[PDB]
Each structure stands twice: as structure tokens, then as C-alpha cells.
Amino acid sequence: IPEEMKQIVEEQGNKLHWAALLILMVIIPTIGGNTLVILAVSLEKKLQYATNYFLMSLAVADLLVGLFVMPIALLTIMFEAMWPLPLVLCPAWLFLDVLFSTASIWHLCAISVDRYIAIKKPIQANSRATAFIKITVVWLISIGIAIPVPIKGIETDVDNPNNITCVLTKERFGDFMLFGSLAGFFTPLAIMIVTYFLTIHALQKKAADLEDNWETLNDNLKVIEKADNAAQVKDALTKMRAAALDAQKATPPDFRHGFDILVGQIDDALKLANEGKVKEAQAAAEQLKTTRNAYIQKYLVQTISNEQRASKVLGIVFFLFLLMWCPFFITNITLVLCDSCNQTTLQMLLEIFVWIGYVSSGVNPLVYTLFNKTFRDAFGRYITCNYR
Ligand SMILES: CC(C)CCC[C@@H](C)[C@H]1CC[C@H]2[C@@H]3CC=C4C[C@@H](O)CC[C@]4(C)[C@H]3CC[C@]12C
Ligand SMILES: CC[C@@H](CO)NC(=O)[C@@H]1C=C2c3cccc4c3c(cn4C)C[C@H]2N(C)C1
């Protein structure tokens, strides 16, 4: 039917405006936004340490996406029918695509776990070797999920060697489009949900112990004040010392120093109590209050509010990262799991959602680092080409 053949002639139209849109809105902000973070970690000597190395690994992964994956994925937009590049590049590009796309997700998952354990066990920290182990393991996972695509390969015809037409066929790669999405997306998703609620419980548990310490400390002061006996000053001071140390152990090693001072005073106080002079010791315990006010009280709200806000913004940005991948993977999963649905339009939907996921992974590290003043005014000097 010529009235339909002409319609397919219109279907294979010109789609340069969409390609220009993707260059302007996604690829350029990806390469630039990631090179900014890499420059920030590389140049700023004050930014160099354990966590930023992992963050830089993530930025490298996303930069590699925006450098090798997306420009070829464009050529597929324009040259819709047949794969233009050589035959080897179809498994090469697909492998790189899955590899990096998985690497970003698992990077975020590992960062979530780290940010949680840092709240749980703050005193147990995080060398360079730890970060190296983490980078290696994450990239090993990404390779392990990505390797079936180059191992299996794209079907070829002895008749038509040229017409490869790169696509993950449902018939050929069905199990991979299922279990690869399960191992690559939904598993770290569930992990991050678990660590989310665990982080809520961890923060709410840390906040209570600080209050108990506070009025543990405050109560015993009242005990020292009304102490007619000598022994109790030793007991009250001992328990105040324990409470002070316990409260100080909630933060990695400046109101925190006020605990050291406090303990010191307490020691001297229970020296007088050990000498017998209770009336002279209670007089110094009556001025433990100055240290208790100038440092401890301001320390309590600072820790809580800081960890609260940081975990909050981290949760939000990570949630918005994972939200923009959902269409791709729910479409990819159902595409396997539906013999009733139309496969053609279901493939077009993937061909659109890939760019939502692409822009989600591309701008993620920059967005995450922009909530840090040091990174911000490093970027400001970089976009003004000032450097150092
Ligand atoms: C050809 C299409 C894909 C667009 C071209 C992309 C490249 C060449 C462009 C797009 C955005 C550009 C980057 C934008 C931001 C910076 C920060 C600056 O401190 C160094 C240059 C650098 C890193 C630019 C280098 C060139 C750049 C990466
Ligand atoms: C729409 C054009 C088609 C052509 O077949 N391209 C794809 O389907 C690519 C395949 C992907 C994939 C498949 C299976 C598991 C996966 C992934 C990814 C990560 N994980 C864990 C990345 C995702 N890529 C971005 C797109």
C-alpha cells in the first residue's frame, strides 16, 4: 500500500533536533560536570582523602559514560536502520554501556552503606587501602554483570554480514535482561531502602543516648552539690567522667574538646575528694558548669543537626537518582515478562527512557558535590578558569 510505504518513509525521518537536544542537555553537562569533580579532587589538596577517592571513582565512571557510550548511542538515533560502525564495536559499546551504567548504581549503594556505618561506628575509622578495596570490588561487580553481553555476542548472518543491527533481543538476551536488571538495579535499590530505615533508627538511637548522658551528667552535679559525705563526690564524679567519655565517643576526632577539659577538671576534683577536702572539691564541681555550658550544650545540638541534615540531603539526592532509572528497568523487566504486550512500542519506550537514566547518572556526582562549600568554590574558580 503506497499510502503506507510513504508513511514509513516518514517514519524514517530526520531526527537531528533530538540529537542536538541530547548533546546540549546531557552529554555536555555530563562530561563537564564530571571533569569538574575530577579536577576538584585532583587539584584541591585539602579535598584529598578516603571518601573523595571513591567519589572520584564514581565521577570517572560517569565521565566514561558521557565520553564513549552516549555519542555512539546518538548515531543509533540518527542511523535508525542499521549499525553503521564495524562489527566488533557493537559488543564493545554494549559491554561498556552496561558496565558503566551498573558501576554508577553500585557506587551509590556502597556510598550509602558507608555513610550509614559512619553514623553507627564513628570511632572505627577508613584508610586509603579500604577505599581501594571498595573501588576494586564495585568495579568487579559491574564487570561481572556486564560480561554476558560480549561473551554471547550479537547474531550474525552468513548471507548479510553487514546488517548487524545492535539490540538486546528478547529471544537471545531475555534471561540477561531479567537477572541482569535484578542484580544490577533492584538489589542495590533494596539495599539502599534497608540502609535508609536503618539510618533513621541509628540517628534516633544516637540522639537519645546523648540526652541520657546530658541529664546523667547534670543530675550527678546536683548530687555533688547536696553531698554532705566525702565518698559520694568520688562516685558522682566517677559517673560524670564516664558519662562525659561516653558522650565524647559519639563523634570522630570544636566543642568536642570541651569534654577533654571537663574530664580533666573532674579528675582534679576527685583528687581533692581522694584527699578528703569535700568542701573544696564541691566548690570546683560547682564550676564544672562553666565548661558544661560553653561547650557540651552547643556540642549536643551540633552533632544531631549535622548528621540529620547530611543524611537527609544524601537520601533525597540518591532517591532522585534511583527514581529516574525506574522506567528503563520496569520496561526492560516487563518486556521479558509479557507475551501479551506489543514488543515494538515497548522497544521505543526503552529507546526513550535510556536517556532519562543517562542524564540521571551523568549529573549525579556534580549534584551531590554541590552541597559542599569547598567543592562549590573550587568549581567557581574552575568555571572562571582561575585554577591555582
Ligand atoms: C562535540 C559535542 C559532544 C560537544 C563537545 C563536548 C566537549 C568538547 C566540551 C563540552 C563541555 C566542555 C567543558 C565544559 C567545562 C569545562 C571546565 C573548564 O574548567 C575546563 C574545560 C571544560 C572541561 C570544557 C571542555 C570542553 C567540553 C568538554
Ligand atoms: C534501548 C537501546 C538498547 C539496545 O539493546 N540498549 C540497552 O538496552 C542497554 C542495556 C542496559 C542494560 C540491560 C540489562 C541490564 C543492565 C543494563 C544496564 C544496566 N544493567 C544492570 C544499562 C542498560 N543500558 C543503559 C542500555
Dump the DSSP string for 85-126: S-STHHHHHHHHHHHHHHHHHHHHHHHHHHHHHHHH-SS---
Atom of ligand 2 nearest to the CA of 353: 1
Break positions in the chain: residue before each gap, C to N over 2.5 angstroms: 125, 253
Distant-in-sequence, close-in-space partners of 119: CB < 8 Å, separation ≥ 6: 199, 202, 203, 206, 307, 311
Give the atom of ligand 2 at the shortest distance from the alpha carbon of 180. Answer: 15
Question: Can you tell me the distance from the alpha carbon of 326 to that of 357, in angstroms, rounded to the nearest whole number?
Answer: 8
Integer Cα distance of 278 and 282 in angstroms:
6
Other beta carbons less than 10 A from residue 243's beta carbon: 22
> What is Dmax (Cα atoms) for the chain?
110
Q: Give me the residue spans of the domains in the chain.
A: 2-167+324-383, 206-301
Do the beta carbons of residue 36 and residue 377 sit within 8 Å? Answer: no
Resolution in A for the shown PDB structure? 3.1
**What single-letter DSSP state applies at residue 147?**
T
Give, to the nearest 10 degrees, the angle between helix 89-120 and helix 50-64.
160
Residue 107 CA to ligand 1 center (angstroms) comes to: 24
Do residues 246 and 303 lie in contact, with contact meaning Cβ atoms separated by under 8 Å?
no
State in Å: Cα 153 to ligand 2 middle.
14
Query: Under a CB-based contact definition with an 8 Å cutoff, are residues 266 and 289 in contact?
Result: no
Q: What is the dihedral of CA 188, 191, 196, 200, to 10 degrees?
A: -160
Among 3.40.109.10, 1.20.1070.10, 3.30.1220.10, 1.10.1270.20, what is the CATH number of 2-167+324-383? 1.20.1070.10
Assign domain 206-301 one CATH number from 3.40.605.10, 1.20.120.10, 2.130.10.10, 3.90.1260.10.
1.20.120.10
Ligand 1 proximity of 20 Cβ (cutoff 6 Å) = no
Q: Which atom of ligand 1 is nearest to the CA of 35?
A: 23
Which ligand ends up closest to the CA of 100? 2
Ramachandran sector of residue 13 (left: φ over 0; alpha: ψ -120 to 50; beta: rest)? beta
- Ligand that comes closest to the CA of residue 35: 1
**Distance from residue 35's CA to the centre of ligand 1 (Å):** 9
Please indicate whether residue 34, judged by its CB atom, sits closer than 6 Å to ligand 1. no
Judge contact between 203 and 308, C-beta under 8 A: yes
Exp. method: X-ray
Contact 206, 302 (CB under 8 A): no
Amino acid at residue number 23: I
Counting ligands in written order, the one closest to the CA of 105 is 2
